Amino acid sequence: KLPPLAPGFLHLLQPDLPIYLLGLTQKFGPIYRLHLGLQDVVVLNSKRTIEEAMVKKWADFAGRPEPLTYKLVSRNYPDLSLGDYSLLWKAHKKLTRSALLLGIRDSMEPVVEQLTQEFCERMRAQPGTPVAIEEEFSLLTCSIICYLTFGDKIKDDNLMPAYYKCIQEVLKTWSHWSIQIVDVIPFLRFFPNPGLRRLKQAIEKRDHIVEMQLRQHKESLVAGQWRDMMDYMLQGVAGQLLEGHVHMAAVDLLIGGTETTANTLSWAVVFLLHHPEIQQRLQEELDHESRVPYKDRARLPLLNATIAEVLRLRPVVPLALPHRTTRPSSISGYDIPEGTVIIPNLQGAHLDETVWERPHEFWPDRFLEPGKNSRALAFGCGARVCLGEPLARLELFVVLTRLLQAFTLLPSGDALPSLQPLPHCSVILKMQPFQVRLQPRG
């Protein structure tokens, strides 16, 4: 009993792949097989099927596949995000996860506060001007992850311009069609590809960045004490966990931690531009509690619910990452053979009317206490949960909390920014370019 096979091939060509995938549940239910590219792959479109796979049968669906680009990004050192589930992988995740949690425990909260403080002051420079916020949230969250991974040396040797430019190049190349098409149609590897050589140049530049940073930490490090995440990770190292593991864990922190959180922030802005009743309510809630520390989260319940909603309705990683079946198993009473690739449709699953009534509507009050509905999972779940989720949820709180108290968000000009996501971009859910006006005071 395999999951039902949906007819057709090259479904890839559909714009809004996660919303098209939700469309096939019409005939085939939450769990079905379909041919993306050449390959047969099962897709999950419900919170039940996703949690049943990822949480319940924990180890059965914790793997990753290995198409061309996965090998290509990690020819020197092992990658964490694209690494298959093993003992060595589990230690890999544990270390970098302890680096985020314990390593920067005292500094994570102040680094965020201070950097977003300077963001608001840069916003201050042009009071009426329409601002291309997207890039400004991108520089913020990139600076934050850089400072927390690499330390003081960033604003000293003035490394932020060159690092941002590198981090951006790397993701932007990799997620583009000319590179992604090779993972699904692997015979295309033999036909010449400028794109893949644009990628190799980006890999080379990111590897030079991380490695120079790695040397400089090693030579200055103190045996008991840790300044940032690389200090912590270097110290918990040396199938043993090597310095190559640290190198890639930094790569995953950098690339994983800019565009994801920054775009979520951008989406929140667009939603508030469409909902100025909510903006005022949020502002008036902030006025009633001169910053709010992250320790005082409970004290802003509507703000938290608004963040939860942004995550529900617009998850920035809408298809998560592909999963691989580690041993023969089953989801929803269908036989799942070993090595079959699983696509966890998070955007689709959050649009379920079974779970979230009026599921297409930006409705923050939905997450408020009477009859509160089930928690969304924009960060995924199980063994493969987003590594930088704590850092992200902090960044989201501090940045919106300070933007709203210090400013009012007005539309760029006459018409509100398009809420519809860019069509062919699935990897990162990005919105159509927009400007916003920031006017003191909230």
Ligand code: HEM
């Ligand atoms: C709103 C912000 C963010 C969202 C919605 C988000 C979402 C996700 C999702 C859905 C996955 C894949 C889950 C799966 O494979 O089942 C993921 C993986 C990951 N994320 Fe994030 N993420 C966010 C921010 C960050 C940040 C800030 C970092 C790092 C600083 C980060 C690092 C990672 C890493 C390293 C993985 C791979 C983990 C693994 O493969 O097990 N993410 N994230």
Ligand SMILES: CC(=O)[C@@]1(O)CC[C@H]2[C@@H]3CCC4=CC(=O)CC[C@]4(C)[C@H]3CC[C@@]21C
């Ligand atoms: C949310 C997500 O999925 C992530 O942001 C979390 C981890 C991210 C990896 C990290 C390493 C990497 C190395 C490269 O040189 C190309 C781009 C990737 C594959 C990069 C893309 C986006 C990922 C997959």
